[PDB]
Amino acid sequence: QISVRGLAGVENVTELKKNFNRHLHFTLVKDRNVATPRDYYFALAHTVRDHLVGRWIRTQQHYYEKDPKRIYYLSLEFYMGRTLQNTMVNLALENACDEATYQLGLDMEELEEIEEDAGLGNGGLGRLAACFLDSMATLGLAAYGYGIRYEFGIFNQKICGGWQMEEADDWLRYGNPWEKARPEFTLPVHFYGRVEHTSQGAKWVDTQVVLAMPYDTPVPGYRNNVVNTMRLWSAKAPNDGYIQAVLDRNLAENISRVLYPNDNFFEGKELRLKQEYFVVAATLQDIIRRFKSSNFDAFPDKVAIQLNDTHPSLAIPELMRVLVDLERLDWDKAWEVTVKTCAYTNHTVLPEALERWPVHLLETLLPRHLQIIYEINQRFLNRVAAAFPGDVDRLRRMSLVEEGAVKRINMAHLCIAGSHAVNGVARIHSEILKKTIFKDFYELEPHKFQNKTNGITPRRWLVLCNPGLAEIIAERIGEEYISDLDQLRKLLSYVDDEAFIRDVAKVKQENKLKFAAYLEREYKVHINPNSLFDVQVKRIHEYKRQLLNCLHVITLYNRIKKEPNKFVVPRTVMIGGKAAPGYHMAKMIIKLITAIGDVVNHDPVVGDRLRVIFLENYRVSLAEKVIPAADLSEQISTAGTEASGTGNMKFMLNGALTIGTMDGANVEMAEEAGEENFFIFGMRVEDVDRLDQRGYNAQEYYDRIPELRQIIEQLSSGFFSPKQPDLFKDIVNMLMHHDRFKVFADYEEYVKCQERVSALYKNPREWTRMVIRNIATSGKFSSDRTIAQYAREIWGVEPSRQRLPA
Ligand SMILES: O=C(CCc1ccc(-c2ccccc2)cc1)NC(=O)N[C@@H]1O[C@H](CO)[C@@H](O)[C@H](O)[C@H]1O
Ligand SMILES: O=c1[nH]cnc2c1ncn2[C@@H]1O[C@@H](COP(=O)(O)O)[C@@H](O)[C@H]1O
Ligand SMILES: *Cc1c(COP(=O)(O)O)cnc(C)c1O
């Protein structure tokens, strides 16, 4: 037992054992003779859940009495992962439960592995929402996460013959002990219909109704007895030949069935539009109800709505609809209230990712909202015209309505017009927003534009996943850093401490052994634990340049084959991540990685000097295992393409060094740690711009770099696919003729930088000292810092570290 995991007092252990047995009997209806590990998991989950309930009821009661300003975080994604360990950590129950289960003859770590991830997100954006909920609870904010309860989250990834296969993620099959259904608070949502203009304003009539039923999940703050709520809506048909009519209820209920996995490319799918309106319409009724339970002038003083990307952008015209059509406020007053209530966070600059909904879809599904959007647009463009008289092209560029073959609504433009604050997610990204894609808006309303650099929760991403590191840190500086990560700066005093150097290195070794064991047990593959663990885990995208990593791997293989008896630093290269189902190039990249592995891992001349592993089914629970085990974090996106990144921050906190471009939050990470303690390579944003101006010619690099030429020839000729020699011709073609992300342009600098990594790894003491310098300066990247900045600079509320009574 370790100190950061809390006390195992005799009274507590006795009480936990008793309640475990009670739940096994009364809740699960099992006896100890036929109980499985799954039953034991559920008995523990219910036992821990019981400790949340008093705190949850009294937190919500406290908000009702004190009536603080409420923060509503609207997201289509909440990538929560597992709940059991996080709850124990935040309630200081971990050691007590470990003791209670041990005394019952059970291994708690084995029970933890049974829990399904709540995979209600795709990647960074979804996981950010999850870290944010944890920080908002920890900082005592009256905050509510609102989303959709998907029946199926992000698909499970299987690799079959080197190819991605998708399997439905039936995460609710065994039940969800954490949620509470609230069928009594079911609300109607309207679709289709038509608008009637009466003498008494507009009326939206002849609609189809879908019911929104809420399920509430507790969100505990770190040891402060605050328990906030995540409310997720589920779609239900209303109760009003016969057989078919009952069967057709599925059509309504399909709204909450499945998370869209296409994080690369916007497609105008009606079902996704319905999901976006569903969450917005149900949430806003809940917001207004809560506000009316103690004149809309005070609405922005009592309510903040944060839009996570443009996905809940319909909140803007929905709030207008409610205020104008139902509450009878004049347009100007309603608009003032709306702007002061709403704020918008942008997460990407790639044009193909922006939501641009066809007008014809909105006209049919949401005819009143389309009318409101047109009126917003006309009044907004009137302001632009008065500020920039005669600038007709600006009017076209800034319009919410896009002209063309199909007319579209630009949802980002809608969000900027209707929000008092617009933020990017890292300093470089927020600057790019002002200088490029939203330049016109910045010139009109400079005061709207902000930066809020992303962060991660140090509860899940240090204490939970890396208790060994948390403990050795706590031994020297105490426990206060867990909720005040800036205190890690105190560790700079230990950079020459021989004991600390040894302890940091020991913790990493243990994490690596544990992960190496996990790979053999669960996936039947053997790795050398003394090799450098070189890790790139993230969704598969061309911009993230898993392909550049692949080129380096093949370079190393070719160098070994050329000089087999020369010493090289042994590496285990691990790449993992899911590809969007319809993204052909991303699926080809996965196949390339496994194909390289097939050749490299079976070459007797290589031995255990180089191994290439594709990490199947990358998800939050796997990140918690692999990140503490990593030596080298690959953060290699083309400069200007990754808005922030957050995986980068997880690796920094956990004792990996970073090889990266000056992109997204990497810039600020290098600034914090010092450029000498970071492996920076490649084009800066300015260099990318210069290449675009003269034109990117991949052929030039192929002609001048013989090692690069060899790799392309190998790919083309069928070296990595002997039975299908032309398998990778799409990859070669893209690289040579149509590469938006300039893979070849960074190749030479990348390979050279990787040599410097290997050089440092040969000197374990200096490697570990650089690691200490990274861990010690990771404090800025706590989501507590991020949320404090949102609270003070956008929401107009003060964070609190003070305990509620237990
Ligand atoms: O996952 C997503 C988008 C997912 C998504 C999923 C589905 C649809 C969709 C829209 C319309 C029709 C059908 C589907 C759009 C987007 N984005 C994301 O993760 N962005 C990352 O946000 C992180 C948090 O700010 C940043 O650190 C990363 O830089 C950014 O790439
Ligand atoms: O009319 C009331 N009388 C007493 N307590 C209330 C009343 N309405 C709401 N509350 C409290 O505040 C609620 C929090 O849930 P909400 O209605 O979603 O904000 C409940 O859990 C109650 O504890
Ligand atoms: C942190 C995290 C991400 C985001 O990683 P990036 O490298 O920033 O894209 C994606 N998926 C999972 C499961 C994560 O935990």
Q: Which of 565, 605, 618, 598 has its CA nearest to residue 155?
A: 618
Q: Given the structure tokens 């900045």, which residue do they identify? A: 789
Nearest CA to ligand 1 atom 6: 263
CA distances from 614 to 162, 595, 606 (A): 9, 10, 18
Contact of 732 with 716, CB cutoff 8 Å: yes
Distance from residue 125's CA to the centre of ligand 1 (Å): 6
With residues binned 3-state (H G I as helix, E B as strand, rest as coil), the percentages for the chain, rounded to 5, are 55, 15, 30
- The number of beta carbons lying within 10 Å of the beta carbon of residue 494 is 19
User: One-letter amino acid identity for 62?
Assistant: H
Measure the CA–CA gap between 806 and 804, rounded to whole angstroms. 6
Measure the CA–CA gap between 465 and 511, rounded to whole angstroms. 10
Contact of 545 with 636, CB cutoff 8 Å: yes
Ligand 3 atom with the shortest distance to the CA of 644 = 8
Residues 148 and 215 in one domain: yes
- CA gyration radius for the chain? 27
Distance from residue 490's CA to the centre of ligand 1 (Å): 36
Measure the CA–CA gap between 768 and 504, rounded to whole angstroms. 7
Token reading at 477: 């500086």
Contact of 773 with 673, CB cutoff 8 Å: yes
Ligand 2 contacts CB of residue 60 (under 6 A): yes
Residues 260 and 114 in one domain: yes
- Where does residue 664 rank: exposed (0-12), middle (13-18), buried (19+ CB within 10 A)? buried
Q: Which of 120, 139, 149 has its CA nearest to residue 71?
A: 139
Contact of 140 with 131, CB cutoff 8 Å: no
- The number of beta carbons lying within 10 Å of the beta carbon of residue 390 is 7
Q: Which of 558, 591, 594, 587 has its CA nearest to residue 573?
A: 594
421-424 and 449-451: which strand pairing? parallel
- Name the residue of 135, 257, 263, 356 to mutate for ligand 1: max ligand atoms within 8 A of Cβ: 263
From the centroid of its chain, how far is CA 56? 26
Residues 137 and 269 in one domain: yes
Backbone angles phi, psi at 543, to 5 degrees: -65, -25
Residues 579 and 555 in one domain: yes
Measure the CA–CA gap between 127 and 81, rounded to whole angstroms. 9
Q: Given the structure tokens 């705190």, which residue do they identify? A: 55
Measure the CA–CA gap between 22 and 496, rounded to whole angstroms. 53
Ligand 3 contacts CB of residue 619 (under 6 A): yes
Measure the CA–CA gap between 793 and 381, rounded to whole angstroms. 28
Residues 767 and 788 in one domain: no
92: left (phi over 0), alpha (psi -120 to 50) or beta: left
- The number of beta carbons lying within 10 Å of the beta carbon of residue 717 is 13
Q: Tell me if 292 is assigned to a ligand binding site.
A: yes
Ligand 3 contacts CB of residue 153 (under 6 A): no
Contact of 650 with 409, CB cutoff 8 Å: no
Ligand 3 contacts CB of residue 126 (under 6 A): no
Nearest CA to ligand 2 atom 1: 293
- Is 505 in a helix, a strand, or coil? helix
Residues 189 and 244 in one domain: yes
Element (H, E) at 65: helix 37-66
Q: Given the structure tokens 């048909």, which residue do they identify? A: 237
Nearest CA to ligand 3 atom 15: 620
Instruction: Output DSSP code: residue 52.
Output: H
Residues 678 and 794 in one domain: no
Ligand 2 contacts CB of residue 208 (under 6 A): no
Element (H, E) at 19: helix 10-22
Q: How many domains does the chain have?
A: 2
Long-range contacts of 379-385 (CB under 8 A, 24+ apart): 379/335, 380/417, 383/444, 384/444
Distance from residue 545's CA to the centre of ligand 1 (Å): 17
Q: Where are the alpha helices (DSSP H) in 615-763?
A: 620-629, 647-653, 666-673, 685-694, 698-704, 706-717, 729-737, 747-761
Distance from residue 677's CA to the centre of ligand 3 (Å): 23
Measure the CA–CA gap between 53 and 168, rounded to whole angstroms. 32
User: One-letter amino acid identity for 465?
Assistant: C
* Domain ranges, residue 577: 456-782
Q: Given the structure tokens 């949430």, which residue do they identify? A: 283
- Is 366 in a helix, a strand, or coil? coil
Contacts of 237 (CB under 8 A, 6+ apart): 210, 211, 249, 251, 252, 253
- Is 664 in a helix, a strand, or coil? coil
- Which ligand has the nearest atom to the CA of 62? 2
Residues 265 and 400 in one domain: yes
User: One-letter amino acid identity for 440?
Assistant: D
Strand partners, 195: 204
Measure the CA–CA gap between 471 and 574, rounded to whole angstroms. 27
Ligand 3 contacts CB of residue 127 (under 6 A): yes
- The number of beta carbons lying within 10 Å of the beta carbon of residue 235 is 23
Element (H, E) at 344: strand 342-345
Q: At what angle do helices 620-629 and 498-523 cross, to 10 degrees?
A: 140
Measure the CA–CA gap between 303 and 301, rounded to whole angstroms. 6
Residues 563 and 694 in one domain: yes
- The number of beta carbons lying within 10 Å of the beta carbon of residue 239 is 6
Long-range contacts of 10-19 (CB under 8 A, 24+ apart): 12/93, 12/96, 13/96, 13/99, 13/100, 13/103, 16/47, 16/93, 16/96, 16/97, 16/100, 17/100, 17/103, 17/104, 19/47, 19/50
Ligand 2 atom with the shortest distance to the CA of 289 = 17
70-74 and 118-120: which strand pairing? unpaired
Distance from residue 236's CA to the centre of ligand 3 (Å): 32
Token reading at 772: 């200490």
Contact of 210 with 278, CB cutoff 8 Å: yes
Distance from residue 561's CA to the centre of ligand 2 (Å): 71
Backbone angles phi, psi at 176, to 5 degrees: -125, 105
Instruction: Output DSSP code: residue 408.
Output: E
Residues 291 and 403 in one domain: yes
Experimental method: X-ray
Contact of 731 with 547, CB cutoff 8 Å: yes
Ligand 2 contacts CB of residue 182 (under 6 A): no
Q: What CATH number is given to the structural domain containing 519?
A: 3.40.50.2000
Residues 289 and 370 in one domain: yes
Contact of 796 with 69, CB cutoff 8 Å: yes
From the centroid of its chain, how far is CA 275? 19
Nearest CA to ligand 3 atom 4: 124
Q: Tell me if 289 is assigned to a ligand binding site.
A: yes
Measure the CA–CA gap between 505 and 475, rounded to whole angstroms. 16
User: One-letter amino acid identity for 68?
Assistant: P
Q: Which of 594, 605, 641, 591 has its CA nearest to residue 741?
A: 641
User: One-letter amino acid identity for 107?
Assistant: D
Instruction: Output DSSP code: residue 91.
Output: H
Positions annotated as catalytic residues are 347, 538-539, 544, 646, 650
Nearest CA to ligand 2 atom 16: 290
Measure the CA–CA gap between 485 and 646, rounded to whole angstroms. 16
Token reading at 453: 């650099």
Token reading at 524: 């039947």
Distance from residue 125's CA to the centre of ligand 3 (Å): 8
Instruction: Output DSSP code: residue 190.
Output: E
- The number of beta carbons lying within 10 Å of the beta carbon of residue 251 is 12
Q: Which of 657, 230, 653, 648 has its CA nearest to residue 454?
A: 648
Ligand 2 contacts CB of residue 1 (under 6 A): no
Measure the CA–CA gap between 643 and 633, rounded to whole angstroms. 17
Ligand 2 atom with the shortest distance to the CA of 61 = 23
User: One-letter amino acid identity for 232?
Assistant: L
Residues 701 and 751 in one domain: yes
Token reading at 397: 């560029």
Nearest CA to ligand 1 atom 11: 266
Q: Tell me if 64 is assigned to a ligand binding site.
A: yes
Strand partners, 343: 306, 421
Q: Count how many residues are written for the chain.
A: 806
Ligand 2 atom with the shortest distance to the CA of 229 = 18
Ligand 3 contacts CB of residue 647 (under 6 A): yes
- Where does residue 625 rank: exposed (0-12), middle (13-18), buried (19+ CB within 10 A)? middle
Measure the CA–CA gap between 675 and 635, rounded to whole angstroms. 15
Element (H, E) at 396: helix 392-398
Measure the CA–CA gap between 701 and 687, rounded to whole angstroms. 16
- Is 736 in a helix, a strand, or coil? helix
Q: Tell me if 765 is assigned to a ligand binding site.
A: no
